[PDB]
Amino acid sequence: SVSKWSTDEVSEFIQSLPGCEEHGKVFKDEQIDGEAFLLMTQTDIVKIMSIKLGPALKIFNSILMFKAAE
Template sequence: MLVSSCPAGSDRRDASRQSGRDPSSWTVEDVMQFVREADPQLGPHADLFRKHEIDGKALLLLRSDTMMKYMGLKLGPALKLCYHIDRLKQGKF
């Protein structure tokens, strides 16, 4: 089971501000923060979201095959990201 974590300090304030907003309004930076906080092991992949200009609307459209084919992610990280994106869509993040 994957566990979400939120670092202490200013990052926690940013996360609480982000979590109250509609994900479709997130910027690329918000998406990168979401990826880092959803699973620390996915943090190294956060820069891919900037490179590919993935904002909140694009994040909600991502699928594992798209992440693997166009972003170069391996299956494991792509599936983990899909899990967190699905939770986000259900309002559980």
């Protein structure tokens, strides 16, 4: 599941979200593997990763759904 995703697997997933293709690199650069991905907050995405609210909302909502699947 998401918790075992590699750093490449998270970056690929983020690029698969609509309007989020540009953000694969920053996630890979910050070494966001699946375990770290599920710990992220919205503020982490918006402020620390410098991602706009639109794509941040799609990313964060995905985190929330994947955590809810555990």
